[PDB]
Design an enzyme around this catalytic site. Structure first.
Site, PDB file in Angstrom:
ATOM      1  N   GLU A 137     -97.322  23.091 -57.395  1.00  0.00           N
ATOM      2  CA  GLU A 137     -97.170  21.936 -58.260  1.00  0.00           C
ATOM      3  C   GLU A 137     -98.441  21.733 -59.069  1.00  0.00           C
ATOM      4  OE1 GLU A 137     -96.632  18.438 -55.924  1.00  0.00           O
ATOM      5  OE2 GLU A 137     -98.593  18.602 -54.949  1.00  0.00           O
ATOM      6  N   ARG A 138     -98.311  20.989 -60.158  1.00  0.00           N
ATOM      7  CA  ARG A 138     -99.482  20.644 -60.941  1.00  0.00           C
ATOM      8  C   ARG A 138    -100.378  19.726 -60.125  1.00  0.00           C
ATOM      9  NH1 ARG A 138     -95.067  20.658 -63.262  1.00  0.00           N
ATOM     10  NH2 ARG A 138     -94.504  21.616 -65.264  1.00  0.00           N
TER      11      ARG A 138
ATOM     12  N   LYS B  24     -87.677   9.984 -60.613  1.00  0.00           N
ATOM     13  CA  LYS B  24     -87.496  10.820 -59.435  1.00  0.00           C
ATOM     14  C   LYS B  24     -88.442  10.413 -58.314  1.00  0.00           C
ATOM     15  CE  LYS B  24     -88.813  15.262 -59.268  1.00  0.00           C
ATOM     16  NZ  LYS B  24     -88.779  16.724 -59.510  1.00  0.00           N
TER      17      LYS B  24
END
Ligand SMILES: Nc1ncnc2c1ncn2[C@@H]1O[C@H](COP(=O)(O)OP(=O)(O)OP(=O)(O)O)[C@@H](O)[C@H]1O
Ligand SMILES: Nc1ncnc2c1ncn2[C@@H]1O[C@H](COP(=O)(O)OP(=O)(O)OP(=O)(O)O)[C@@H](O)[C@H]1O
Ligand SMILES: Nc1ncnc2c1ncn2[C@@H]1O[C@H](COP(=O)(O)OP(=O)(O)O)[C@@H](O)[C@H]1O
Ligand SMILES: [Mg+2]
Ligand SMILES: [Mg+2]
Ligand SMILES: [Mg+2]
Lengths: 475, 90, 507, 99, 282, 295
Positions: free
Chosen positions: F180-181, F154
């Site tokens: 997000e991480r 991705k």
């Protein structure tokens, strides 16, 4: 006594009186307003304050308007003058034919008849419909329920019962429309003027003469607030109680749909300051219904037969409204969508349907035995639906295959073309007597019709039509 | 519906013109107790997430600062704490 | 007595006394506002804030007033002054809205100028009754073969366009709008002309712009007005816009003019109402929806009516639209609306993914009015077509065994497949009624059975061009008589024979 | 018991204890009569456009310009601090209902 | 000053009364002098004994495979229109032979039918069915119907238990039937919600278990020192879609000494009474 | 203006002003503690009091603490200087490379384009990928779902879209990380610096020279409270609206993850005490998603 509006919340109005309060259920008239707005008292709140439910729209009200107490609850006229005439919840006619020149008026709210003043004599009705005449016989002088979702054929069934019962009744009749389409109301009015149930005549001087009519009409429809929907059935019940009390004559009452009455409470109790129950319904969901149903009862004076169409939201029969309503009925007819998708009409589920007038001490033992054999057959067919869907009919034995054949045949045979469906079906109506139904069921169960096809039982009435259709289909 | 300042022991002071508000921002009086929660009046100056200490040595965390009270969670049992006790900031 | 003291200290006390026509905001949040003052305010009254924002006087408490803001909660501050407009919530109507995109409150957005004004009909009016109403006895030319044939929509009807997302609902609506051009331009008499209204609720603004562009291309805005309440707009405006469109159509209904209103989608409006209700701390119900949702939709739809001979004779159709989820129509909102409408137009994702477009199922689609909303010429053909499609639906379970089956079953399958390939249509390509009658006459007379299925498309097109070149007299005779006599029928058979002769196909 | 009940009980106690009763009684009666006769003091109490500082200033001016004890002034300042000024009249009735 | 109480005695036998002992048969008043409090403390552990005598139900599957004793509390749980009231009425009718062929009150079994939520037509039909068989000279009825307010539906079963405690403490056996108990729970929910008390699961309070435990623990078999009486209970419950995982069925299953399940599949297959002998136990 | 904190309930701060309350969506800066704290107004309550959602933690706050009203909503910087940088919801950089020297600031709450200023002619987007342009053609002004997690490629697709749209269409791009991480953000930053999407060249003095890059970044970390994670997509969206309006060139916006934005909205609605909708989600779900996606 004069009072002032202090608060307005949708279909609820809190009013303030100075000197003396009105009791509960009393009617109040607002003066500075275009129409005749009527308010029904519901609560007392202290500070000489009162809470009320409005029978019409509150758009235009002002905090300060004046209110007049009528001293009595809502009064609906009664007599043979209401016959052949439409009347809203407050008795005002909306037929555009003049006023109601009735002498006596009854209160919308009356206590139900007592325990001693009851007479549970078992009788039967001739509906002309095979399924109800066979497996759910309707009780003359009892309550009847038509449970179904949306688009399964309750209104058509009620119209068929009207054509097959009320015209062949002789006595009086009443129709209450509680949150139904105004279109079907006008359709019923014109069909009644056609069939002679309503005999309207225009005199030279604009007046009218409804002499000869045998049906009253009360309509509180979707284009109405909740307060004008939760008090219409009571109006119709007063109109029918007058007949079966003073007149002492049997009457037929038709209600479309009763569920709307509870729904109005659902969209009112939040404004009255009450804690909601399970599904947002009211805590008063059972008493507000029992107080309506217990007024419907055969007594030593007269009798009210009732045919109520009960909506079922989201096809969920475990909803509180139909669940509560089931306890008040003497006969039941549960319509289904799964059966309507097969083109079967009336889409009656003969297993969920039941009745109290099926015992052999009322109907004969041949009727009882035929009905119970048919029920056993259909249950045995239902028990194989999973294994037929997954594996197939080939896995079944020969007895099970014979059962499946007879069950499909008797399903298709319990399908009747009504007279009112001719407008969107084309095929003519078929009245069916009871002994012909019983003979046909006996023959189909014995095995005297296994040679015939399956699509020969679809919309044929008796068996002679089935055999003629099989002959024509052989070609 | 009554506020801790509206109880009928303080209004006897305010009505009497008593201005003994010299009680610092460090000290407060317990107002309510239950189920491992305490609710105080005072400590105008305590930080969120700050430790506080009661009369009987136990300690707690101030979480729900409010306009009229302070909510405290207790590192122990409520049998030690009772209404009227004093609380001080650490 | 003591007013001098307050006048001296507050320095402006005398002006804040008249709280009967001017009020002051107190709290704001969640689209709701609380006002102190406005003792002489009517319920449902329109209220004007300081910065031009407006609202509805919803609740009249004992002292405060609860107001709904037709906008975002940023142009309204605590302390702002509030006035009375002195009238209930109303919208403009009449000629002047035609060809104009407007918001829920009649304010234009297409950038073309202001709008003239009638006495500004109200929004939440009551519907008509039973006596002035009339049964449906004339059609609404939609331009779709399957709808005009099998699911006929009347004039004074309420038929529902229900189906999952991306199935061709807005397409049906816009085709119904476009088909009226030839009928309107050819008459010059407002009793027969059909105007229209397209209400977008919670719809993407790009789609509305594309629709307006496609209508302006085909000159279909001389007789249409659009009411936009999109997703960026607040929830009260989505809750209103349907009522505003119905108020705009009530002018045609009362006047005697015929108008059709299309709602895109009503469910979005229900969601907006649910939002406003939950933000007013009201108690939820089934799927969190309150109990006043049925009353909402029924208030809205019961206005669609066919007025009588004495009330002018007007009409007002309504083609509400609903989006389902995985085709479930046993849900709460679909069933609430099915209990209100006079029909149902179903749309499937299977038929739309296969290629069948419009994806109009026919066993689930129904219509209570039926033949009464049809002309005799189309009755005589659509009856046979409906019967043959019923037979095909019945006997399609064993289609793979057509070789093992009798010739009757194979003939039924062939006729059904030909008809099914004949009900297909392109986007933005309606058909007149006479052309539909001619095409279905060709179809139900076995002229397409031997013909290959894929050819039936171009066949149709060619046939149309043929009958638009030489046999215009047949079309005018059908449009005038509204009937297929034996003479016109023989003429049509001769034309069909000449067409099949002069042209070559796969079979 | 109630809010006005609490304030009235506190004032009754402190009036029976230290200062007087007839003074505060007449003061409350005069205030109630002014509320029921002026028709603008009531709106001054109920209106939110009036700032807390303007409220306290007008109250102290009423203190100075009339026979007034400090207990009633502290009562009014307390009712303003707790947003209970509309409960003046009710409180007055309690002080009249104790007679 | 009176705590809510009801009359008790043999004056109730053959009579139909409301929740408060007021008659509704329409024939005379209630000749009873001694009263009894409605809400009372159940008897303890010591003045009790094991169940050894049977309660002849008249049916075959019950009396054989799902037996019932005197001092027992056995539930009759099922769906709508499955044969519950019929089971109870057959239990009442089977006793006329046993009672006629004796004059020892220690062996006779008196009966009490509590109708909560029912409509008066149904109660009249039941009274007619009992009078047609001379099965009322040893029964009484307590009708708290649907038109009657919620408090009467909430109090009627306790009134019936009070009327049966007279037999229990006097050394005379009695059987009390509650039709349906769930209706009582609904009435209690209505009252509690209108008193602004907060709800719980399915909008019910938390005190529903206490309500039914209070009611059913009064059924008991007393010792030879306390007379030796008994009060058998046969409550009735209507489930929806056979869901006995619900809130009221689960409670009343966990506080009873048995179960008589009834199914619609077996009812239409031909098995009537539709007793599922697998799930049903004792 | 200057106000005082009246109460603190987790991430819900109620503040009092003496006069001229701030409108809703305005920003308030707390004074008297480190970790610069920004409060977004959400509701008026009366008594000149307002309710606010905090963009950072509320630990260490005191009642009576002074608060300033900036007089406008959260204002993010915009320009070609935001290219190659990372920024939080309040516009501050978190890349340890200096401040953003932009000559402009845009509010994150901006009205959507009107009905008139909108194009009726749809058109595809020439990416340069075969399967995309063949079987799932994109469009200008469109919103493209991307159903796929990790282990599929991705991130490389993302960088390729950015590079190809910058080369051919000349248009820049934006990436928004909605909860997000953090290690994933570091990995993405290093992959961008490697692939040439970002050009972080050191300077002599010790500063950096972010020369012609192809993407700005706006990271809303998972450790950030609800209120920040809900107002991150609007920041990147304004940064992109800058390029759309004045620059007049097509731009690509990437949001990772849309659902997380919905979760943040649901949480924020639960804190303020709003009654939840059907499946626990907020009652302002479709409205907020439309306020976002209509821009
Ligand atoms: N007869 C048709 N032939 C070919 N394509 C069609 C046809 N009808 C509709 N479509 C196509 O279906 C797609 C969706 O059209 P439409 O917007 O009308 O459906 P929808 O149900 O309104 O979707 P949405 O949920 O977004 O509103 C369009 O691309 C349109 O071109
Ligand atoms: N042994 C039986 N044999 C044949 N029919 C029976 C038998 N027992 C009950 N029934 C029939 O079942 C039907 C329901 O009777 P019953 O009064 O017991 O309903 P129920 O189970 O109590 O449910 P509800 O009272 O809520 O309607 C009646 O028609 C009855 O004749
Ligand atoms: N006997 C029937 N024959 C053919 N169609 C029927 C029949 N009964 C119902 N339908 C169809 O189902 C629909 C049911 O609508 P309606 O009669 O109003 O029932 P309901 O009140 O349950 O909605 C009708 O439109 C009709 O097309
Ligand atoms: Mg109906
Ligand atoms: Mg669409
Ligand atoms: Mg029963």
């Amino acid at each position: 006594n004069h009072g002032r509006i202090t608060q307005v919340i949708g279909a609820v109005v809190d009013v303030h009186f100075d000197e003396q309060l009105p009791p509960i259920l009393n009617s109040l008239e607002v003066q500075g307003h275009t129409n005749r707005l009527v308010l029904e008292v519901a609560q007392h709140l202290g500070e000489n304050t009162v809470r009320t439910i409005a029978m019409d729209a509150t758009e235009g009200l002002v905090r300060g308007q004046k209110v007049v107490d009528t001293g009595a609850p809502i009064q609906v006229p009664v007599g043979v003058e209401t016959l052949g005439r439409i009347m809203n919840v407050i008795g005002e006619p909306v037929d555009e034919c003049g006023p109601v020149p009735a002498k006596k008026t009854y209160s919308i709210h009356r206590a139900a008849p007592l325990f001693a003043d009851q007479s549970t004599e078992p009788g039967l009705l001739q509906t002309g419909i095979k399924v109800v005449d066979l497996l759910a016989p309707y009780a003359k002088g009892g309550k009847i329920g038509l449970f179904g979702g949306a688009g399964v054929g309750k209104t058509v069934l009620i119209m068929e019962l009207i054509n097959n019962v009320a015209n062949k009744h002789g006595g009086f009749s009443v129709f209450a429309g509680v949150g139904e389409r105004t279109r079907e109301g006008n359709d019923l009015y014109h069909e009644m003027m056609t069939t002679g149930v309503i005999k309207r005549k225009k005199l030279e001087d604009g007046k009218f003469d409804f002499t000869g009519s045998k049906a009253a009409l009360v309509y509180g429809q979707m284009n109405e607030p909740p307060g004008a929907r939760a008090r219409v059935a009571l109006t119709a019940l007063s109109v029918a109680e007058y007949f079966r009390d003073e007149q002492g004559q049997d009457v037929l009452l038709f209600i479309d749909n009763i569920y709307r009455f509870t729904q109005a409470g659902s969209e009112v109790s939040a404004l009255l300051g009450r804690i909601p129950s399970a599904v947002g319904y009211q805590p008063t969901l059972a008493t507000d219904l029992g107080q309506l149903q217990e007024r419907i009862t055969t007594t030593k004076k007269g009798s009210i037969t009732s045919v109520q169409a009960v909506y079922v939201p989201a096809d969920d029969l475990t909803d509180p409204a139909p669940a509560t309503t089931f306890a008040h009925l003497d006969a039941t007819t549960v319509l289904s969508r799964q059966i309507a998708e097969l083109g079967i009409y009336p889409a009656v589920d003969p297993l969920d349907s039941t009745s109290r007038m099926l015992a052999p001490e009322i109907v004969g033992q041949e009727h009882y035995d035929t009905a119970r054999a048919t029920q056993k057959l259909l249950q045995d067919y239902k028990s194989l639906q999973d294994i037929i869907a997954i594996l197939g009919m080939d896995e079944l034995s020969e007895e099970d295959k014979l059962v499946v054949s007879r069950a499909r045949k008797i399903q298709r045979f319990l399908s009747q073309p009504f007279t009112v469906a001719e407008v969107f079906t084309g095929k003519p109506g078929r009245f069916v007597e009871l002994p012909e139904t019983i003979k046909s069921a006996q023959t189909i169960l014995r095995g005297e019709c296994d040679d015939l096809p399956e699509m020969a039982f679809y919309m044929c009435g008796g068996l002679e039509e089935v055999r003629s259709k099989a002959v024509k289909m052989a070609q | 519906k009554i506020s801790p300042s509206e109880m009928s022991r303080l209004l006897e002071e305010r009505i009497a013109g008593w201005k003994t508000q010299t009680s610092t921002e460090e000290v407060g009086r317990v107002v309510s107790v239950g189920d491992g929660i305490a609710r105080l009046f005072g400590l105008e100056g305590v930080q969120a997430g700050e430790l506080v200490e009661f009369q009987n040595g136990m300690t707690g965390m101030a979480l729900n600062l409010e306009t009229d009270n302070v909510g405290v969670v207790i590192f122990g049992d409520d049998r030690s704490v009772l209404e009227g006790d004093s609380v001080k900031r650490t | 007595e003591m007013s001098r003291l307050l006048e001296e200290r507050i320095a402006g006390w005398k002006t804040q006394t008249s709280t009967e026509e001017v009020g002051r905001v107190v709290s704001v949040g969640d689209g709701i506002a609380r006002l102190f003052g406005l003792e002489g305010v009517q319920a449902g009254e329109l209220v004007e804030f300081q910065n031009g924002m407006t609202g509805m006087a919803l609740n009249l408490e004992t002292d405060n007033v609860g107001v709904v803001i037709f906008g975002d909660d940023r142009s309204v501050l605590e302390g702002d002054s509030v006035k009375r407009t002195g009238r209930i919530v109303d919208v403009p109507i009449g000629p002047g809205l035609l060809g104009r995109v407007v918001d829920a409150l009649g304010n234009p957005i297409d950038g073309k100028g202001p709008i003239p004004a009638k006495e500004r009909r109200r929004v939440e009016l009551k519907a008509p009754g039973i006596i002035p109403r009339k049964s449906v006895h004339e059609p609404m030319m939609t331009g779709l073969k399957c709808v005009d044939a099998l699911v006929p929509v009347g004039r004074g009807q309420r038929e529902l366009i229900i189906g999952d997302r991306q199935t061709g609902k807005t397409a049906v609506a816009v085709d119904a709008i476009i088909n009226q051009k030839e009928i309107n331009d050819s008459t010059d008499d407002e009793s027969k002309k059909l105007y229209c209204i397209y209400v977008a609720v919670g719809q993407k603004r790009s789609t509305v712009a594309q629709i307006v562009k496609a209508l302006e291309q085909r000159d279909a805005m001389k007789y249409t007005t659009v009411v936009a309440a999109t997703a960026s707009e607040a929830a009260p405006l989505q809750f209103l816009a349907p009522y505003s469109g119905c108020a705009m159509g009530e002018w045609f209904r009362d006047s005697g003019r015929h108008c059709v209103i299309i709602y895109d989608d009503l469910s979005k409006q229900a969601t907006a109402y649910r939002q406003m209700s939950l933000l007013l701390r009201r108690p939820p119900g089934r799927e969190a929806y309150p109990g006043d949702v049925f009353y909402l939709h029924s208030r809205l739809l019961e206005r669609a009516a066919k007025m009588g001979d004495k009330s002018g004779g007007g009409s007002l159709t309504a083609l509400p639209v609903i989006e389902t989820q995985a085709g479930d129509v046993s849900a709460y909102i679909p069933t609430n609306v099915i209990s209100i409408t006079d029909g149902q137009i179903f749309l499937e994702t299977e038929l739309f993914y296969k290629g069948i477009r419009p994806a109009i199922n026919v066993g689930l689609s129904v219509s209570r009015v039926g033949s009464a909303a049809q002309v005799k010429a189309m009755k005589q053909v659509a009856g046979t077509m409906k019967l043959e499609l019923a037979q095909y639906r019945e006997v399609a379970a064993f289609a793979q065994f057509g070789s093992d089956l009798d010739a009757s079953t194979r003939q039924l399958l062939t006729r059904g497949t030909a008809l099914t390939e004949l009900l297909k249509q392109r986007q933005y390509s309606p058909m007149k009624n006479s052309v539909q009658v001619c095409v279905l006459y060709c179809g139900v007379k076995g002229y397409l059975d031997p013909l290959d299925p894929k050819e039936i498309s171009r066949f149709e097109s060619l046939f149309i061009d043929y009958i638009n070149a030489n046999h215009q007299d047949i079309l005018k005779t059908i449009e005038t008589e509204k009937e297929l006599s034996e003479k016109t029928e023989a003429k049509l058979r001769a034309a069909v024979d000449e067409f099949v002769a002069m042209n070559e196909f796969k079979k | 018991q109630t809010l006005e009940g609490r304030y009235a009980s506190a004032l009754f106690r402190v009036a029976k204890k230290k200062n007087q009763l007839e003074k505060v009684y007449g003061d409350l009666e005069s205030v109630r009569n002014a509320l029921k006769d002026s028709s603008e003091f009531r709106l001054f109490v109920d209106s939110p456009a009036v700032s807390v500082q303007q409220k306290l200033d007008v109250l102290r001016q009423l203190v100075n310009r009339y026979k007034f004890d400090p207990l009633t002034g502290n009562l009014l300042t307390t009712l303003v601090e707790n947003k209970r000024l509309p409960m003046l009249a009710r409180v007055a009735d309690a002080f009249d209902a104790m007679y």
